[PDB]
Design a protein around this ligand. Structure first.
Ligand code: K65
Ligand code: K65
Lengths: 12, 229, 229, 12
């Protein structure tokens, strides 16, 4: 799935 | 719980060690133990709490998406069973964080910086619950996320400058909530654009270091806008 | 244990799903459950077992090294306490794997391919125990690793061609055992060079696919030799 | 610590 930018560590 | 016998300061120190070791489940358990001491958290400690659980839930979300995709393609019980196992563990982590926030981080947070930080977290963890929710419980979970984010937004607009990194990260996440959870892409785009433009106009007030903090999150807003428009 | 009620075939399928999801702790627990069914493992199932625990212990080893380095630099009790916590968990995983091998994977393994695979694993997990061991228990653990590797080597030389990937990976790991656990760098270099040269001379017998399998591990031997000479 | 190449996933 295309994930959009969210705050903090990009851990997924 | 199992951290009840360890000093608060020791729990914080071990959370920082666990971060260095990339042991995020341990980091989260140490920070849960620190929160349960009952004292309010400093900015650094809030960040340790958030980083720990973001990493834990992030691994679960990524696993859940892999499994959901295999399950959808396959539509024996094994894929569904295992996707459910991962889903329940994810929901358990979200419930643990939400539990810390309601007992009693949010109610004890009076400063804007701490109250906005926690309400943004409440929005985020209801958003992760919404990502896996299916039906009417889904509607109620979405509204809980919306409510938390909105209250955080209201405080941040009244109490923080438009370049404040907590305010910026809140708007970023609330805009992603709108885009793909609430199916409100126009609200998402409007929020991201207004947030970006108001921060841009305030950058001249900042030191070199604060400028770097603010422009880093503004670039994430721009990244999303580029994909959405 | 907790997998006693799940079908063997379901456990294998879920191990493969867990691998895709990068959920290696789950993958290891599913494979432990499959082993405990009491039936011998196929080549694919042996590889699922090994990959699962290698990933789990790998994360622990990496964390332990970070913590040991901070501890050594620092020489309160917290760093030592937390390094000990991680160390005990690592030892627990090694003991679990060694337990599966002795009860009863090794004794039930009669074919060279399966017996060498398991004895190499026994060498590897005693080697991970040796990495964290301190003193005389250290000597006994080192000898246990040596013994397992040596028996695997003896079988592999008698029963497998020099390009066999299991044989090659065994020699690779035994050479690293010599270099940094047994403090025998010359034995390590000699083993890696002889293994590489004998495989090189046998590559002409292989299909394109087997050639690719063998040369991939030969490149790891060369990588080590480049660093050691 | 400098780690040498060993067999299988480079997970540490
Ligand atoms: C590197 C140290 C550092 O930045 N410490 C802090 C000091 C004051 C406020 C916040 C922090 C903080 C932000 S993220 C973070 C983390 N440990 N991930 C810690
Ligand atoms: C991709 C599938 C595949 O290679 N399956 C096999 C079939 C026959 C023997 C071994 C394997 C195997 C080697 S590593 C591995 C893993 N799941 N990591 C599986």
């Amino acid at each position: 799935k295309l994930m959009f930018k969210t705050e903090g560590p990009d851990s997924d | 719980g199992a951290m009840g016998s360890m000093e608060r300061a020791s729990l914080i120190q071990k959370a920082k060690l666990a971060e260095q070791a990339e042991r995020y489940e341990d980091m989260a358990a140490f920070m849960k133990g620190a929160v349960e001491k009952g004292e309010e958290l400093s900015c650094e400690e809030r960040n340790l709490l958030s980083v720990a659980y973001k990493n834990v839930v992030g691994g679960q979300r990524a696993a859940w998406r892999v499994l959901s995709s295999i399950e959808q393609k396959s539509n024996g019980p094994e894929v569904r069973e295992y996707r459910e196992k991962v889903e329940t563990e994810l929901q358990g982590v979200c419930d643990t964080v939400l539990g810390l926030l309601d007992s009693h981080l949010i109610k004890e947070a009076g400063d804007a910086e701490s109250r906005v930080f926690y309400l943004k977290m409440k929005g985020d963890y209801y958003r992760y619950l919404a990502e896996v929710a299916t039906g009417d419980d889904k509607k109620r979970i979405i509204d809980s996320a919306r409510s938390a984010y909105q209250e955080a937004m209201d405080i941040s607009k009244k109490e923080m400058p438009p370049t404040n990194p907590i305010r910026l990260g809140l708007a970023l996440n609330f805009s992603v909530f709108h885009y793909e959870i609430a199916n409100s892409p126009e609200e998402a785009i409007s929020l991201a654009k207004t947030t970006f433009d108001e921060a841009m106009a305030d950058l001249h007030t900042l030191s070199e270091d604060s400028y770097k903090d603010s422009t880093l999150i503004m670039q994430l807003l721009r990244d999303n806008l580029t994909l959405w428009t």
